[PDB]
Design a protein around this motif. Structure first.
Motif, PDB file in Angstrom:
ATOM      1  N   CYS A   1      56.940 -44.609 -12.671  1.00 18.61           N
ATOM      2  CA  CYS A   1      55.695 -44.430 -13.396  1.00 18.61           C
ATOM      3  C   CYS A   1      55.351 -42.968 -13.637  1.00 18.61           C
ATOM      4  O   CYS A   1      54.359 -42.691 -14.319  1.00 18.61           O
TER       5      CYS A   1
ATOM      6  N   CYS B   1      56.803 -40.189  -8.544  1.00 18.35           N
ATOM      7  CA  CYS B   1      57.473 -41.468  -8.712  1.00 18.35           C
ATOM      8  C   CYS B   1      58.338 -41.436  -9.962  1.00 18.35           C
ATOM      9  O   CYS B   1      57.978 -40.823 -10.968  1.00 18.35           O
TER      10      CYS B   1
ATOM     11  N   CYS C   1      55.078 -46.315  -4.140  1.00 18.67           N
ATOM     12  CA  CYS C   1      54.095 -45.773  -5.069  1.00 18.67           C
ATOM     13  C   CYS C   1      52.930 -46.745  -5.179  1.00 18.67           C
ATOM     14  O   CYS C   1      53.083 -47.852  -5.704  1.00 18.67           O
TER      15      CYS C   1
END
Ligand SMILES: [Zn+2]
Lengths: 621, 75, 406, 76
Positions: free
Chosen positions: C188, C185, C251
């Motif tokens: 993050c 991702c 995510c």
């Protein structure tokens, strides 16, 4: 020609005082000592940093329908410009607390904003590889008569932009993206100036000094690069972080930089000599954005926004004392003591819903917060029923297991840390539920068949003047709370409109609703056209153990709401026969794959649970 | 549940599915997202073809699973 | 009458049954895979012992459930070994004295075709079929039989002893490998990966109809111009792919549709890497939705004689690969064409029968061939490679490439 | 399936058929696409004359196969 329009709505209280998710950006107005939080829960909250205040809350202004990636406070703290992941950049009013004009020019998640205080010039870069320069003086002058502004744009980017920065003089604008290259324009003329290379990964933090001849870049690879724009080259690299760097700050003198990223730590690095560095604090979550206290030099405290819902202010007093200690630990085996242990000030935050489960009746949801608390919502009625608290989630799921089936008619997404229901034309009216099963009882005992999606959409626009049938309003069964947001956003893209339920009763919202909502919502909400009825084909054959000769395989068809009781009564009357219900129960048994079927358990339930095959459903008597 | 599919050109696309949809539904979605008719295309998961008619659960397909997409070079 | 001088190579073609060019090519490449013959021989030995034991104990045992699914799975190996034995016997007979075979030298694979067509109903008739699909069916059925045999022997049970374990996982130890479906991702930076097996590498082939620059003047025009090699195509398959726009990774760590960087990594490598060229294309447009815009990329890639997946392997891969067989489609479309295998006869030292049951053939060592159905003709290395290049042959476009670990 | 139809004049005609199709059907299609009557068509493959009561697979006729079509004239 036009994309897919999805109607969404959010179950939430009237006021969400605390943060319900991470906070993406912070802005501080030293004139009023206010603090703005750009939470990931799509809400902007105004705090009062004054410590002696018991309640730091002031007010909120909620208009975004997705993450709020970055905000900039412009016009000496009078107007707020916020970039959100709903592909919009808005124009709030910080002093008043409401939004004036929404810009939807970007076609993807807007991820950054840059402010040029001297010229009041604001740029808005996003994930659509576009940069759109704006003038706040023109933006704040937007009205109904003048709502079109020439979309001053920058060209050159080929990757989705994650950061943006403009110097105070408004003569240099630098964008950082997944391209790993900082493309520099000249905002006065929009001409490309140069491209800066050297970062090996995505860049999320960008800073520029007063004259625009120096830049600071915060990259996701965990390094800091100081760019001297005069020579178009970096002059120093700061490998201070272990994990990535997503937030940067620098004082007025452009001398010390406060970095903070994934490893939940924040340091202060001397830009001249990075040998000395002081660990400001170790947060409980990765740090997303910060905002220094610019009321004094050196700054007295630094505000920090984490992936958690709590906003922490950390004290910077004693930084000179820590640097004068002489603790020049040349050995890496000695861990640096954090300057602060506990935050000087805490802004309390709520809990984010992290796990969701919708029960088989497709009306209730069991949501598990970040406090491990579990809740019990009601999608149709849009209200929380019981907060069961810290009880095991799976056991609570198995306790509330149902023996009925309702076809899927929406989806639940917790992107904003709260519970949001999205309705799509493809499947919204796939669910039909008997009135008794839904829990609503008619005075005469009649049980109509109500489409849950249509019954919900009727109540979502109950105040809409076109829906008042000549006075009957909404659906007449329940009332979703007025403070409930309603969102009409296109599928996987922008958002056309957002309003509360009670907003439809006005004029301008009413005038925009007819254009914003699509036709298939009008199919039921206004036209009152009852949606399509799903049908079931099935087979009726005598059972082997019954002893009767094999009868012709009749492929009868009916509706999914037909009870097995009706089918068994018809079989009893037309097969073996050639008060009634009880005798059929005591005499006639209907079996699918040779097991007794519940008379009150419906046919689509049979398909989903017992048949477990791709062929046509078979019933044996 | 979200699965990836490697298109003909080599770029991945994402599909929103459930563990209880047949390969025909997946092929229809890939047709929607790329334009290849469902009958022409073939799907390969974990080194095996996805026979039409079978659901998705029996292939133990979970989130973040990639289905390579190829056509039928007849001869 | 002396146009070909009645010259017949010792190597045996296979008389196609009318439209079995695909199947015949697949059987001819499979015949030269290192260890496939020995593996099938070991499977036949095991199958025969089990069949004779079941025949002997059938009278003693009561209620014998002889399901026909296992019978057909057994019959596939039966037919494969029968065909291998017939082909090798005819090869030996021709090698001893070739006067009786003045015409073409080939064996009809009727048994294996019948086995496939009863096993898979879509091979009925004499239509045309994808060679890759036939290879997939054969390998999948062989793996199914192998795992059934392994389960049966485990149930029965419960210097070097690996000889008996050589054949029980033939498909696993030959064609199937392991991948890492790593996804990162970008909001993050959390890495979530999957671990999926693979047997063939679905490598893309691109026509110059996509990724077109809007201006190419104000924006940077292009980094460089390069003829698409196989390394570029593999990188396109298994390098960092920024999933942006209409498709975004969801995510669960941040509960949002965020941009991601997907990178496929080669953890465990099979002994035979199959590269399935996507010479077909959708032509970008659907041709006003006229039943899809099917097309074929007649221009091949610059496929090399060696490969090294170190660039996309987790652990440092110190073992390279070498091309030994290619299946070529000699048509102008995808709905029809003349399949032709092209294998490199080598590995004569290890080209031996299974132990559970060189100089003579060294004349063709390290030389390519062109198995045009029942007609066999030898092609040298250099001219074959030249024909492989896109400049020379726009007709015999390669489809499948098989690389054996060295 | 594609079969090359070659006459004594050196002309190659491409016909799309199936091996399950009979020789009579092949001759009818050849007449439709070329005008040559089926009775005048003499098909030779590997020195074997095709019979209208059989099929392509019966005589083992492959794809891209050159079949010697001989025109038979009644009268002369
Ligand atoms: Zn994430």
């Amino acid at each position: 020609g036009r994309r897919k329009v999805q109607v969404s709505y959010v179950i939430r209280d009237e006021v969400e005082k605390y943060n319900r998710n991470g906070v993406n950006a912070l802005q501080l107005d030293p004139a009023l000592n206010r603090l703005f939080t750009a939470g990931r829960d799509s809400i902007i909250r105004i705090w009062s940093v004054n410590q002696h205040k018991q309640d730091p809350y002031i007010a909120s202004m909620e208009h975004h329908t997705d993450w709020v990636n970055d905000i900039v406070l412009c016009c000496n703290g009078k107007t707020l410009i916020s970039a959100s992941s709903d592909t919009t950049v808005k124009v709030w009013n910080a002093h008043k607390g409401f939004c004036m004009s929404t810009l939807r020019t970007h076609k993807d998640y807007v991820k950054a904003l840059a402010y040029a205080k001297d010229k009041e010039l604001v740029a808005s870069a996003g994930l659509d590889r576009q940069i759109f320069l704006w003038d706040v003086n023109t933006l704040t002058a937007l009205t109904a008569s003048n709502n079109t502004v020439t979309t001053s744009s920058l060209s050159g980017n080929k990757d989705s932009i994650y950061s943006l920065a403009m110097n105070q003089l408004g003569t240099i604008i630098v964008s950082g993206s997944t391209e790993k290259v900082l493309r520099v324009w000249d905002p006065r003329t929009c001409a490309k100036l140069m491209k800066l290379k050297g970062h090996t990964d995505n860049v999320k933090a960008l800073l520029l000094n007063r004259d625009g001849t120096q830049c600071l870049s915060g990259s996701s690879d965990g390094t800091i690069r100081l760019w001297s724009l005069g020579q178009q080259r970096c002059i120093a690299t700061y490998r201070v972080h272990d994990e990535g760097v997503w937030a940067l700050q620098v004082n007025d003198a452009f001398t010390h930089v406060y970095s903070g990223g994934r490893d939940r730590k924040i340091y202060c690095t001397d830009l001249r000599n990075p040998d000395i560095r002081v660990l400001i604090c170790e947060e409980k979550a990765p740090v997303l954005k910060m905002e220094l206290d610019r009321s004094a030099d050196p700054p007295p405290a630094i505000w920090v926004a984490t992936t958690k819902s709590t906003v922490n202010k950390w004290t910077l007093k004693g930084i000179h004392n820590f640097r004068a200690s002489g603790d020049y630990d040349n050995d890496c085996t000695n861990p640096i003591t954090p300057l602060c242990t506990q935050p000087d000030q805490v802004i309390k935050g709520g809990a984010s819903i992290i796990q969701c489960h919708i029960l088989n009746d497709k009306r209730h949801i069991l949501t598990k917060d970040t406090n491990n608390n579990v809740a019990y919502w009601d999608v149709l009625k849009a209200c929380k029923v019981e907060d069961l608290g810290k009880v095991d989630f799976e056991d609570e799921i198995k306790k509330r297991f149902k023996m009925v089936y309702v076809p899927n008619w929406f989806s639940v997404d917790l992107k904003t840390g709260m519970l949001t229901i999205t309705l799509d034309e493809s499947d919204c009216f796939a669910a039909w539920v008997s009135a008794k099963d839904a829990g609503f009882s008619s005075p005469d005992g009649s049980d109509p068949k109500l489409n849950l999606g249509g019954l919900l959409l009727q109540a979502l626009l109950e105040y809409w003047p076109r829906t008042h049938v000549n006075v009957q309003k909404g659906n007449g069964y329940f009332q979703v709370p007025p403070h409930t947001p309603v969102i009409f956003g296109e599928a996987g893209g922008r958002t056309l409109f957002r309003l509360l339920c009670r907003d439809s009763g006005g004029e301008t919202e009413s005038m925009l609703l007819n254009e914003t909502v699509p036709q298939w919502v009008i199919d039921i909400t206004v036209d009152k056209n009852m949606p399509k009825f799903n049908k079931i084909p099935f087979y009726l054959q005598p059972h082997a153990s019954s002893g009767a000769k094999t009868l012709k395989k009749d492929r009868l068809s009916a509706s999914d709401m037909l009870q097995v009781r009706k089918v068994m009564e018809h079989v009893y009357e037309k097969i073996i026969n050639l008060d009634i219900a009880v005798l059929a129960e005591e005499k006639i048994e209907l079996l699918c794959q040779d097991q007794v079927l519940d008379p009150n358990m419906d046919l689509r339930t049979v398909k989903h649970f017992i048949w477990k095959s791709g062929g046509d459903l078979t019933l044996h008597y | 549940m979200q699965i990836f599919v490697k298109t003909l050109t080599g770029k991945t696309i994402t599909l929103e599915v459930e563990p209880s949809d047949t390969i025909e539904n997946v092929k229809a979605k890939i047709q929607d997202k790329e334009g290849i008719p469902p009958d022409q295309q073939r799907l390969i998961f974990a080194g095996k073809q996805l026979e039409d008619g079978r659901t998705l659960s029996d292939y133990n397909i979970q989130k973040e699973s990639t289905l390579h997409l190829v056509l039928r070079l007849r001869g | 009458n002396c146009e070909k001088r009645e010259n017949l190579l010792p190597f045996v073609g296979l008389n196609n049954l009318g439209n079995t060019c695909y199947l015949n090519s697949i059987l001819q490449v499979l015949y030269f895979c290192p260890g496939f013959k020995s593996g099938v021989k070991h499977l036949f030995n095991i199958i025969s012992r089990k069949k004779e034991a079941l025949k002997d104990e059938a009278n003693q045992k009561d209620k014998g459930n002889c399901k026909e699914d296992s019978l057909a799975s057994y019959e596939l190996i039966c037919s494969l070994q029968s065909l291998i034995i017939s082909v090798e016997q005819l090869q030996a007979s021709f090698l001893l004295n070739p006067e009786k075979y003045t015409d073409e030298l080939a064996t009809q694979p009727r048994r294996l075709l019948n086995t496939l067509r009863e096993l898979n109903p879509m091979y009925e008739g004499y239509l045309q079929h994808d060679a890759q699909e036939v290879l997939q069916c054969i390998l999948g059925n062989i793996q199914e039989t192998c795992q059934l045999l392994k389960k049966e022997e485990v149930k029965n049970v419960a210097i070097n002893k690996g000889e008996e374990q050589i054949g029980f996982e033939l498909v696993e130890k030959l064609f199937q490998g392991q991948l890492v479906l790593r996804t990162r991702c970008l909001e993050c930076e959390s890495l979530t990966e999957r671990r999926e097996d693979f047997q063939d590498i679905s490598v893309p082939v691109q026509e110059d109809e996509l990724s077109k620059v809007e201006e190419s003047s104000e924006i940077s025009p292009e980094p460089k111009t390069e003829m698409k090699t196989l390394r570029w195509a593999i990188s396109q398959f298994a390098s960092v792919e920024r999933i942006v726009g209409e498709d975004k990774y969801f995510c669960e760590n941040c509960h949002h549709y965020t941009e991601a960087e997907r990178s496929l990594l080669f953890d465990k490598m099979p002994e035979v890497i199959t590269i399935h060229l996507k010479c077909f294309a959708a032509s970008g447009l659907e041709f006003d939705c006229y039943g899809g815009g099917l097309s074929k990329i007649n221009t091949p890639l610059l496929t090399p004689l060696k490969l090294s997946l170190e660039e996309w392997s987790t652990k440092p891969t110190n073992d390279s690969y070498g091309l030994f067989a290619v299946v070529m489609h000699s048509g102008i479309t995808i709905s029809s064409g003349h399949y032709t295998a092209s294998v490199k006869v080598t590995d004569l030292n290890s080209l031996e029968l299974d132990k559970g049951n060189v100089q003579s053939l060294k004349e063709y060592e390290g030389k390519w061939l062109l198995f045009d159905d029942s007609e066999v003709k030898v092609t040298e290395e250099k001219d074959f490679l030249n024909s492989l290049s896109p400049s020379t042959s726009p007709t015999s476009t390669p489809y499948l490439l098989f690389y054996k670990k060295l």
